[PDB]
PDB file of C-alpha atoms and ligand atoms in Angstrom:
ATOM      1  CA  UNK A1415     231.198  39.109 -14.487  1.00 48.31           C
ATOM      2  CA  UNK A1416     229.190  38.471 -11.314  1.00 46.08           C
ATOM      3  CA  UNK A1417     225.427  38.095 -11.202  1.00 44.43           C
ATOM      4  CA  UNK A1418     223.198  41.164 -10.951  1.00 43.01           C
ATOM      5  CA  UNK A1419     220.125  42.907 -12.258  1.00 43.45           C
ATOM      6  CA  UNK A1420     220.982  43.498 -15.944  1.00 42.82           C
ATOM      7  CA  UNK A1421     220.822  42.094 -19.528  1.00 38.36           C
ATOM      8  CA  UNK A1422     223.948  40.083 -19.542  1.00 39.44           C
ATOM      9  CA  UNK A1423     223.907  39.302 -15.805  1.00 36.51           C
ATOM     10  CA  UNK A1424     220.232  39.324 -14.719  1.00 35.64           C
ATOM     11  CA  UNK A1425     217.827  36.639 -13.645  1.00 36.12           C
ATOM     12  CA  UNK A1426     217.760  34.854 -16.989  1.00 38.57           C
ATOM     13  CA  UNK A1427     221.515  34.217 -16.699  1.00 38.70           C
ATOM     14  CA  UNK A1428     221.722  33.054 -13.082  1.00 41.34           C
ATOM     15  CA  UNK A1429     221.235  29.407 -13.888  1.00 42.82           C
ATOM     16  CA  UNK A1430     224.709  29.161 -15.480  1.00 44.46           C
ATOM     17  CA  UNK A1431     226.441  29.846 -12.108  1.00 41.30           C
ATOM     18  CA  UNK A1432     223.620  28.519  -9.920  1.00 41.26           C
ATOM     19  CA  UNK A1433     221.870  25.625 -11.673  1.00 40.89           C
ATOM     20  CA  UNK A1434     219.289  25.286  -8.840  1.00 41.77           C
ATOM     21  CA  UNK A1435     217.751  28.387 -10.538  1.00 44.75           C
ATOM     22  CA  UNK A1436     215.757  25.809 -12.568  1.00 44.53           C
ATOM     23  CA  UNK A1437     214.936  23.735  -9.425  1.00 45.61           C
ATOM     24  CA  UNK A1438     211.688  22.373  -8.070  1.00 46.04           C
ATOM     25  CA  UNK A1439     210.955  24.981  -5.388  1.00 47.44           C
ATOM     26  CA  UNK A1440     212.177  28.336  -6.684  1.00 50.29           C
ATOM     27  CA  UNK A1441     210.909  31.762  -5.626  1.00 50.56           C
ATOM     28  CA  UNK A1442     209.209  34.111  -6.122  1.00 48.79           C
ATOM     29  CA  UNK A1443     205.911  32.861  -7.553  1.00 48.44           C
ATOM     30  CA  UNK A1444     202.638  34.314  -8.689  1.00 47.51           C
ATOM     31  CA  UNK A1445     200.016  33.825  -5.965  1.00 44.16           C
ATOM     32  CA  UNK A1446     196.778  32.666  -7.595  1.00 43.12           C
ATOM     33  CA  UNK A1447     194.362  33.814  -4.977  1.00 43.25           C
ATOM     34  CA  UNK A1448     191.515  31.720  -6.234  1.00 43.38           C
ATOM     35  CA  UNK A1449     193.626  28.515  -6.283  1.00 43.09           C
ATOM     36  CA  UNK A1450     195.287  29.047  -2.920  1.00 46.04           C
ATOM     37  CA  UNK A1451     193.869  26.594  -0.411  1.00 46.24           C
ATOM     38  CA  UNK A1452     192.356  27.983   2.871  1.00 43.68           C
ATOM     39  CA  UNK A1453     193.995  25.783   5.531  1.00 41.84           C
ATOM     40  CA  UNK A1454     192.085  25.882   8.831  1.00 38.75           C
ATOM     41  CA  UNK A1455     195.156  24.008  10.435  1.00 40.72           C
ATOM     42  CA  UNK A1456     197.361  27.138   9.859  1.00 41.44           C
ATOM     43  CA  UNK A1457     197.937  29.167  13.046  1.00 45.75           C
ATOM     44  CA  UNK A1458     198.108  32.940  13.485  1.00 49.53           C
ATOM     45  CA  UNK A1459     201.515  34.242  12.742  1.00 46.05           C
ATOM     46  CA  UNK A1460     203.405  35.182  15.984  1.00 46.50           C
ATOM     47  CA  UNK A1461     205.658  38.114  15.331  1.00 43.64           C
ATOM     48  CA  UNK A1462     207.558  39.165  18.444  1.00 43.64           C
ATOM     49  CA  UNK A1463     209.687  42.128  17.674  1.00 44.96           C
ATOM     50  CA  UNK A1464     209.522  44.115  20.960  1.00 45.15           C
ATOM     51  CA  UNK A1465     213.160  43.374  21.853  1.00 45.11           C
ATOM     52  CA  UNK A1466     214.570  43.668  18.358  1.00 42.77           C
ATOM     53  CA  UNK A1467     217.960  45.361  18.339  1.00 43.36           C
ATOM     54  CA  UNK A1468     218.984  46.873  15.112  1.00 44.04           C
ATOM     55  CA  UNK A1469     222.613  47.524  14.619  1.00 42.83           C
ATOM     56  CA  UNK A1470     223.484  48.789  11.180  1.00 41.96           C
ATOM     57  CA  UNK A1471     222.354  49.440   7.601  1.00 39.55           C
ATOM     58  CA  UNK A1472     224.361  48.242   4.709  1.00 37.13           C
ATOM     59  CA  UNK A1473     224.375  48.740   0.883  1.00 36.99           C
ATOM     60  CA  UNK A1474     225.478  45.299  -0.248  1.00 37.10           C
ATOM     61  CA  UNK A1475     225.436  46.172  -3.907  1.00 34.90           C
ATOM     62  CA  UNK A1476     221.935  45.069  -4.749  1.00 32.98           C
ATOM     63  CA  UNK A1477     219.838  46.016  -1.768  1.00 32.76           C
ATOM     64  CA  UNK A1478     220.167  47.816   1.512  1.00 32.65           C
ATOM     65  CA  UNK A1479     220.087  45.560   4.522  1.00 34.05           C
ATOM     66  CA  UNK A1480     218.949  46.620   8.060  1.00 37.16           C
ATOM     67  CA  UNK A1481     220.855  44.140  10.292  1.00 34.82           C
ATOM     68  CA  UNK A1482     219.846  42.985  13.767  1.00 34.37           C
ATOM     69  CA  UNK A1483     221.772  41.474  16.604  1.00 36.28           C
ATOM     70  CA  UNK A1484     220.667  37.889  16.385  1.00 35.82           C
ATOM     71  CA  UNK A1485     222.947  36.495  19.127  1.00 37.83           C
ATOM     72  CA  UNK A1486     220.056  36.286  21.694  1.00 43.21           C
ATOM     73  CA  UNK A1487     216.578  35.170  21.716  1.00 41.99           C
ATOM     74  CA  UNK A1488     214.960  38.567  20.808  1.00 42.09           C
ATOM     75  CA  UNK A1489     213.002  39.210  17.654  1.00 40.63           C
ATOM     76  CA  UNK A1490     211.356  35.957  16.668  1.00 40.84           C
ATOM     77  CA  UNK A1491     208.835  34.610  14.233  1.00 38.41           C
ATOM     78  CA  UNK A1492     206.812  31.513  15.097  1.00 39.76           C
ATOM     79  CA  UNK A1493     203.431  29.961  14.585  1.00 37.28           C
ATOM     80  CA  UNK A1494     201.771  30.344  11.269  1.00 34.22           C
ATOM     81  CA  UNK A1495     202.955  27.375   9.228  1.00 32.50           C
ATOM     82  CA  UNK A1496     206.240  27.106  11.162  1.00 30.21           C
ATOM     83  CA  UNK A1497     207.347  24.327  13.454  1.00 27.86           C
ATOM     84  CA  UNK A1498     210.046  26.110  15.310  1.00 29.09           C
ATOM     85  CA  UNK A1499     211.417  29.412  16.375  1.00 24.57           C
ATOM     86  CA  UNK A1500     212.974  31.624  13.780  1.00 25.55           C
ATOM     87  CA  UNK A1501     215.160  34.573  14.711  1.00 27.44           C
ATOM     88  CA  UNK A1502     215.228  37.874  12.801  1.00 24.21           C
ATOM     89  CA  UNK A1503     218.595  38.555  11.248  1.00 24.00           C
ATOM     90  CA  UNK A1504     217.886  41.373   8.755  1.00 24.34           C
ATOM     91  CA  UNK A1505     215.422  42.973   6.445  1.00 25.92           C
ATOM     92  CA  UNK A1506     215.742  44.380   2.917  1.00 25.11           C
ATOM     93  CA  UNK A1507     213.553  45.406  -0.024  1.00 25.81           C
ATOM     94  CA  UNK A1508     213.218  44.848  -3.733  1.00 25.60           C
ATOM     95  CA  UNK A1509     211.804  47.652  -5.873  1.00 25.41           C
ATOM     96  CA  UNK A1510     211.252  48.962  -9.358  1.00 28.05           C
ATOM     97  CA  UNK A1511     212.250  51.787 -11.665  1.00 28.96           C
ATOM     98  CA  UNK A1512     208.511  52.739 -11.833  1.00 29.30           C
ATOM     99  CA  UNK A1513     205.633  52.360  -9.394  1.00 29.30           C
ATOM    100  CA  UNK A1514     204.093  49.678 -11.619  1.00 29.40           C
ATOM    101  CA  UNK A1515     206.770  47.051 -10.890  1.00 31.90           C
ATOM    102  CA  UNK A1516     209.217  46.089  -8.171  1.00 31.67           C
ATOM    103  CA  UNK A1517     207.716  43.225  -6.175  1.00 32.94           C
ATOM    104  CA  UNK A1518     209.051  39.671  -6.507  1.00 34.36           C
ATOM    105  CA  UNK A1519     205.874  37.873  -5.611  1.00 31.26           C
ATOM    106  CA  UNK A1520     202.802  38.849  -7.597  1.00 31.99           C
ATOM    107  CA  UNK A1521     199.088  38.442  -6.644  1.00 33.42           C
ATOM    108  CA  UNK A1522     196.895  37.367  -9.586  1.00 32.87           C
ATOM    109  CA  UNK A1523     199.701  38.750 -11.742  1.00 36.63           C
ATOM    110  CA  UNK A1524     199.602  42.151  -9.985  1.00 37.70           C
ATOM    111  CA  UNK A1525     203.031  43.683  -9.372  1.00 39.94           C
ATOM    112  CA  UNK A1526     203.468  45.968  -6.395  1.00 38.39           C
ATOM    113  CA  UNK A1527     205.948  48.914  -6.283  1.00 39.73           C
ATOM    114  CA  UNK A1528     208.219  47.089  -3.828  1.00 38.57           C
ATOM    115  CA  UNK A1529     208.441  44.146  -1.453  1.00 36.34           C
ATOM    116  CA  UNK A1530     209.917  44.008   2.046  1.00 33.99           C
ATOM    117  CA  UNK A1531     211.633  40.760   3.147  1.00 33.01           C
ATOM    118  CA  UNK A1532     212.071  40.182   6.904  1.00 29.96           C
ATOM    119  CA  UNK A1533     214.533  37.288   7.071  1.00 29.78           C
ATOM    120  CA  UNK A1534     214.579  34.790   9.942  1.00 27.04           C
ATOM    121  CA  UNK A1535     216.626  31.609  10.570  1.00 30.35           C
ATOM    122  CA  UNK A1536     215.549  28.470  12.355  1.00 33.27           C
ATOM    123  CA  UNK A1537     217.123  28.374  15.776  1.00 31.99           C
ATOM    124  CA  UNK A1538     217.452  24.590  15.604  1.00 36.33           C
ATOM    125  CA  UNK A1539     220.428  25.129  13.137  1.00 33.97           C
ATOM    126  CA  UNK A1540     222.365  27.513  15.374  1.00 35.22           C
ATOM    127  CA  UNK A1541     223.203  30.212  12.879  1.00 38.07           C
ATOM    128  CA  UNK A1542     222.159  31.593   9.490  1.00 40.73           C
ATOM    129  CA  UNK A1543     224.959  29.991   7.462  1.00 42.06           C
ATOM    130  CA  UNK A1544     224.008  26.493   8.614  1.00 43.87           C
ATOM    131  CA  UNK A1545     220.291  27.229   8.288  1.00 39.68           C
ATOM    132  CA  UNK A1546     220.472  28.028   4.537  1.00 43.20           C
ATOM    133  CA  UNK A1547     221.723  24.485   3.998  1.00 46.54           C
ATOM    134  CA  UNK A1548     218.419  23.052   5.272  1.00 44.67           C
ATOM    135  CA  UNK A1549     214.957  22.760   3.648  1.00 42.60           C
ATOM    136  CA  UNK A1550     213.357  24.395   6.700  1.00 40.47           C
ATOM    137  CA  UNK A1551     216.226  26.735   7.458  1.00 38.15           C
ATOM    138  CA  UNK A1552     214.669  30.160   6.834  1.00 36.82           C
ATOM    139  CA  UNK A1553     211.281  31.865   7.181  1.00 31.13           C
ATOM    140  CA  UNK A1554     210.952  35.042   5.121  1.00 32.47           C
ATOM    141  CA  UNK A1555     208.021  37.330   5.858  1.00 32.87           C
ATOM    142  CA  UNK A1556     207.178  39.200   2.653  1.00 33.81           C
ATOM    143  CA  UNK A1557     205.193  42.440   2.695  1.00 33.50           C
ATOM    144  CA  UNK A1558     204.053  44.322  -0.391  1.00 31.76           C
ATOM    145  CA  UNK A1559     204.466  48.092  -0.735  1.00 29.28           C
ATOM    146  CA  UNK A1560     202.030  50.276  -2.696  1.00 32.12           C
ATOM    147  CA  UNK A1561     202.491  53.995  -3.322  1.00 30.83           C
ATOM    148  CA  UNK A1562     200.039  56.258  -1.507  1.00 29.33           C
ATOM    149  CA  UNK A1563     200.218  57.727   1.979  1.00 28.77           C
ATOM    150  CA  UNK A1564     203.640  57.735   3.641  1.00 30.25           C
ATOM    151  CA  UNK A1565     204.692  54.980   6.071  1.00 35.70           C
ATOM    152  CA  UNK A1566     205.988  57.016   9.075  1.00 36.80           C
ATOM    153  CA  UNK A1567     207.856  54.019  10.504  1.00 35.54           C
ATOM    154  CA  UNK A1568     209.806  53.793   7.293  1.00 33.45           C
ATOM    155  CA  UNK A1569     211.202  57.341   7.244  1.00 34.21           C
ATOM    156  CA  UNK A1570     214.198  56.672   9.533  1.00 31.48           C
ATOM    157  CA  UNK A1571     215.376  54.138   6.918  1.00 32.52           C
ATOM    158  CA  UNK A1572     214.738  56.509   4.039  1.00 31.09           C
ATOM    159  CA  UNK A1573     216.644  59.324   5.668  1.00 29.84           C
ATOM    160  CA  UNK A1574     219.838  57.306   6.223  1.00 26.31           C
ATOM    161  CA  UNK A1575     219.992  56.166   2.586  1.00 25.26           C
ATOM    162  CA  UNK A1576     221.985  59.152   1.398  1.00 26.36           C
ATOM    163  CA  UNK A1577     224.788  57.965   3.791  1.00 24.70           C
ATOM    164  CA  UNK A1578     224.959  54.505   2.107  1.00 27.29           C
ATOM    165  CA  UNK A1579     224.535  55.505  -1.479  1.00 25.70           C
ATOM    166  CA  UNK A1580     227.054  53.128  -2.965  1.00 26.44           C
ATOM    167  CA  UNK A1581     228.045  49.480  -2.689  1.00 25.76           C
ATOM    168  CA  UNK A1582     229.844  48.612   0.510  1.00 29.71           C
ATOM    169  CA  UNK A1583     228.791  51.646   2.508  1.00 28.77           C
ATOM    170  CA  UNK A1584     227.352  51.071   6.007  1.00 30.82           C
ATOM    171  CA  UNK A1585     225.967  53.293   8.745  1.00 29.55           C
ATOM    172  CA  UNK A1586     225.109  52.689  12.449  1.00 29.38           C
ATOM    173  CA  UNK A1587     221.421  52.073  12.703  1.00 26.86           C
ATOM    174  CA  UNK A1588     220.358  51.445  16.253  1.00 30.25           C
ATOM    175  CA  UNK A1589     216.930  51.514  17.877  1.00 38.09           C
ATOM    176  CA  UNK A1590     215.000  50.932  14.665  1.00 32.40           C
ATOM    177  CA  UNK A1591     211.732  49.223  15.414  1.00 31.53           C
ATOM    178  CA  UNK A1592     210.556  46.917  12.555  1.00 31.32           C
ATOM    179  CA  UNK A1593     207.011  46.785  14.045  1.00 31.76           C
ATOM    180  CA  UNK A1594     206.571  50.144  12.235  1.00 28.00           C
ATOM    181  CA  UNK A1595     206.724  48.340   8.918  1.00 27.97           C
ATOM    182  CA  UNK A1596     203.888  45.888   9.515  1.00 30.85           C
ATOM    183  CA  UNK A1597     200.299  46.206   8.117  1.00 30.70           C
ATOM    184  CA  UNK A1598     197.300  45.902  10.398  1.00 32.26           C
ATOM    185  CA  UNK A1599     196.447  42.355   9.355  1.00 32.18           C
ATOM    186  CA  UNK A1600     198.701  39.281   9.605  1.00 32.67           C
ATOM    187  CA  UNK A1601     196.578  37.265   7.164  1.00 29.70           C
ATOM    188  CA  UNK A1602     199.017  35.413   4.842  1.00 26.47           C
ATOM    189  CA  UNK A1603     199.756  32.986   2.082  1.00 28.82           C
ATOM    190  CA  UNK A1604     202.532  30.393   2.545  1.00 29.31           C
ATOM    191  CA  UNK A1605     204.479  27.981   0.370  1.00 29.67           C
ATOM    192  CA  UNK A1606     207.934  26.253   0.293  1.00 28.07           C
ATOM    193  CA  UNK A1607     210.472  28.090  -1.831  1.00 30.61           C
ATOM    194  CA  UNK A1608     213.927  29.524  -2.157  1.00 30.38           C
ATOM    195  CA  UNK A1609     216.186  32.518  -1.806  1.00 33.39           C
ATOM    196  CA  UNK A1610     215.273  34.890  -4.634  1.00 36.98           C
ATOM    197  CA  UNK A1611     218.891  35.848  -5.387  1.00 39.61           C
ATOM    198  CA  UNK A1612     221.964  33.728  -5.858  1.00 32.93           C
ATOM    199  CA  UNK A1613     222.763  31.300  -4.367  1.00 32.31           C
ATOM    200  CA  UNK A1614     219.005  30.523  -4.820  1.00 34.90           C
ATOM    201  CA  UNK A1615     219.062  27.863  -2.064  1.00 34.11           C
ATOM    202  CA  UNK A1616     215.836  25.962  -1.492  1.00 34.41           C
ATOM    203  CA  UNK A1617     215.688  26.691   2.215  1.00 34.84           C
ATOM    204  CA  UNK A1618     212.786  29.111   2.677  1.00 30.83           C
ATOM    205  CA  UNK A1619     209.273  28.855   4.098  1.00 31.25           C
ATOM    206  CA  UNK A1620     207.690  31.928   2.491  1.00 28.20           C
ATOM    207  CA  UNK A1621     204.984  33.797   4.440  1.00 24.84           C
ATOM    208  CA  UNK A1622     203.508  36.580   2.282  1.00 26.40           C
ATOM    209  CA  UNK A1623     201.097  38.994   3.914  1.00 27.21           C
ATOM    210  CA  UNK A1624     197.897  39.776   2.034  1.00 29.27           C
ATOM    211  CA  UNK A1625     197.663  43.410   3.196  1.00 27.56           C
ATOM    212  CA  UNK A1626     200.230  45.766   1.605  1.00 27.71           C
ATOM    213  CA  UNK A1627     201.722  48.715   3.419  1.00 26.54           C
ATOM    214  CA  UNK A1628     201.432  52.202   1.898  1.00 26.65           C
ATOM    215  CA  UNK A1629     204.596  54.271   1.332  1.00 29.23           C
ATOM    216  CA  UNK A1630     204.745  57.663  -0.306  1.00 28.19           C
ATOM    217  CA  UNK A1631     206.130  58.380  -3.772  1.00 25.52           C
ATOM    218  CA  UNK A1632     208.842  60.371  -2.129  1.00 22.67           C
ATOM    219  CA  UNK A1633     209.880  57.435   0.066  1.00 21.90           C
ATOM    220  CA  UNK A1634     210.224  54.994  -2.887  1.00 18.24           C
ATOM    221  CA  UNK A1635     211.896  57.671  -4.914  1.00 20.13           C
ATOM    222  CA  UNK A1636     214.691  57.763  -2.363  1.00 16.56           C
ATOM    223  CA  UNK A1637     215.172  53.966  -2.701  1.00 15.52           C
ATOM    224  CA  UNK A1638     215.737  54.606  -6.406  1.00 15.93           C
ATOM    225  CA  UNK A1639     218.596  57.082  -5.748  1.00 15.51           C
ATOM    226  CA  UNK A1640     220.754  54.287  -4.324  1.00 18.67           C
ATOM    227  CA  UNK A1641     223.445  52.882  -6.529  1.00 13.97           C
ATOM    228  CA  UNK A1642     224.489  49.300  -7.490  1.00 13.80           C
ATOM    229  CA  UNK A1643     228.048  50.561  -8.147  1.00 13.23           C
ATOM    230  CA  UNK A1644     230.712  51.405  -5.635  1.00 14.51           C
ATOM    231  CA  UNK A1645     232.004  54.932  -4.973  1.00 15.35           C
ATOM    232  CA  UNK A1646     234.075  56.329  -7.826  1.00 15.70           C
ATOM    233  CA  UNK A1647     232.436  54.073 -10.473  1.00 11.60           C
ATOM    234  CA  UNK A1648     229.999  54.980 -13.167  1.00 14.40           C
ATOM    235  CA  UNK A1649     226.582  55.410 -11.695  1.00 17.64           C
ATOM    236  CA  UNK A1650     224.002  52.601 -11.991  1.00 14.85           C
ATOM    237  CA  UNK A1651     220.832  53.424 -10.207  1.00 15.18           C
ATOM    238  CA  UNK A1652     219.693  50.618  -7.837  1.00 16.08           C
ATOM    239  CA  UNK A1653     216.290  49.876  -9.473  1.00 14.57           C
ATOM    240  CA  UNK A1654     214.567  46.712 -10.694  1.00 15.59           C
ATOM    241  CA  UNK A1655     216.373  44.442  -8.230  1.00 14.04           C
ATOM    242  CA  UNK A1656     213.583  41.848  -8.387  1.00 18.43           C
ATOM    243  CA  UNK A1657     213.448  38.327  -9.794  1.00 22.13           C
ATOM    244  CA  UNK A1658     210.337  37.570 -11.842  1.00 22.08           C
ATOM    245  CA  UNK A1659     207.867  34.845 -10.860  1.00 20.10           C
ATOM    246  CA  UNK A1660     209.129  31.267 -11.300  1.00 18.09           C
ATOM    247  CA  UNK A1661     207.228  28.069 -12.134  1.00 19.50           C
ATOM    248  CA  UNK A1662     205.116  26.790  -9.294  1.00 19.30           C
ATOM    249  CA  UNK A1663     205.832  23.122 -10.255  1.00 17.53           C
ATOM    250  CA  UNK A1664     204.552  20.690  -7.704  1.00 15.99           C
ATOM    251  CA  UNK A1665     203.533  23.178  -4.999  1.00 15.76           C
ATOM    252  CA  UNK A1666     200.439  24.298  -3.202  1.00 14.90           C
ATOM    253  CA  UNK A1667     200.036  27.798  -1.839  1.00 18.60           C
ATOM    254  CA  UNK A1668     197.998  27.815   1.401  1.00 17.75           C
ATOM    255  CA  UNK A1669     195.983  30.723   2.791  1.00 17.23           C
ATOM    256  CA  UNK A1670     195.512  31.477   6.470  1.00 17.36           C
ATOM    257  CA  UNK A1671     192.196  33.252   5.760  1.00 17.47           C
ATOM    258  CA  UNK A1672     188.828  32.911   4.086  1.00 22.00           C
TER     259      UNK A1672
HETATM  260  C1  V26 B 136     219.538  38.055   3.794  1.00 23.34           C
HETATM  261  N1  V26 B 136     219.896  36.830   3.066  1.00 23.34           N
HETATM  262  C2  V26 B 136     219.367  36.516   1.832  1.00 23.34           C
HETATM  263  C3  V26 B 136     217.991  36.734   1.557  1.00 23.34           C
HETATM  264  F1  V26 B 136     217.277  37.158   2.591  1.00 23.34           F
HETATM  265  C4  V26 B 136     217.347  36.487   0.359  1.00 23.34           C
HETATM  266  S1  V26 B 136     215.616  36.742  -0.020  1.00 23.34           S
HETATM  267  N2  V26 B 136     215.498  37.851  -1.138  1.00 23.34           N
HETATM  268  O1  V26 B 136     215.019  37.225   1.192  1.00 23.34           O
HETATM  269  O2  V26 B 136     215.229  35.425  -0.509  1.00 23.34           O
HETATM  270  C5  V26 B 136     218.185  35.959  -0.638  1.00 23.34           C
HETATM  271  F2  V26 B 136     217.684  35.740  -1.864  1.00 23.34           F
HETATM  272  C6  V26 B 136     219.523  35.615  -0.416  1.00 23.34           C
HETATM  273  F3  V26 B 136     220.213  35.054  -1.398  1.00 23.34           F
HETATM  274  C7  V26 B 136     220.132  35.901   0.817  1.00 23.34           C
HETATM  275  S2  V26 B 136     221.861  35.519   0.944  1.00 23.34           S
HETATM  276  O3  V26 B 136     222.363  35.925   2.278  1.00 23.34           O
HETATM  277  O4  V26 B 136     222.042  34.110   0.629  1.00 23.34           O
HETATM  278  C8  V26 B 136     222.665  36.487  -0.307  1.00 23.34           C
HETATM  279  C9  V26 B 136     222.808  37.964   0.046  1.00 23.34           C
HETATM  280  C10 V26 B 136     221.581  38.780  -0.016  1.00 23.34           C
HETATM  281  C11 V26 B 136     221.398  39.659   1.013  1.00 23.34           C
HETATM  282  C12 V26 B 136     220.308  40.493   0.993  1.00 23.34           C
HETATM  283  C13 V26 B 136     219.302  40.394   0.020  1.00 23.34           C
HETATM  284  C14 V26 B 136     219.381  39.360  -0.935  1.00 23.34           C
HETATM  285  C15 V26 B 136     220.514  38.610  -0.942  1.00 23.34           C
HETATM  286 ZN1   ZN B 137     214.637  39.539  -0.743  1.00 23.53          ZN
END
């Protein structure tokens, strides 16, 4: 009876195994755009993905993960609100059963169809597993997806999904360039928060871009053909793998713009 994205094992149950679920800096949150504070001290985000080296794509049972070789100083996130250098380790998405839901963060209560998480760890902690044990261990760049025109830089991911349909499947995934997933603007909101799945560790500086990317209905439809189950088990479509917004408690969301 492990955690997941259903009635008896979904987000409202996670606190029994992971009591930090009711902690002081949980994610996601609703972003109140009127209450977010413009912070003229915030720097432009520096996203340096030119040398990123993707390796593989994996269905981990609740998302698909595009993994990068993070053993050199390649794909890094810096600036913005961050004090160090954070290295890209992987990206994944959260999405809905319907276009009207799927994002984890919300913007004035608006839910997007999906949300992309580009996950980076602080190089001062040496590796990802040590970083998640620190309050400044991770920087996650969150990007909303809306349904409209296709995202061409997404299609290589979409097309490999039929090869990783079920939990535990992987496929080689080299030469994927994550710059194809970024909107034109790097304007953002930022706040201190957590992993949005168990173990829910309070280790994340969230950086959420204001500008969504467009993907086509056919692209998100292929996300929804994935399965939470393993091969040879009853089929459970991988949909609604998002945590709802959590209490903001004693936090301020800062805006890089306006
Ligand atoms: C990639 N690591 C990761 C993560 F990025 C996030 S999120 N949604 O970005 O805060 C999580 F919520 C999260 F829980 C993890 S995990 O590696 O500890 C547990 C395994 C896992 C892997 C992929 C997606 C979610 C959780
Ligand atoms: Zn995520």
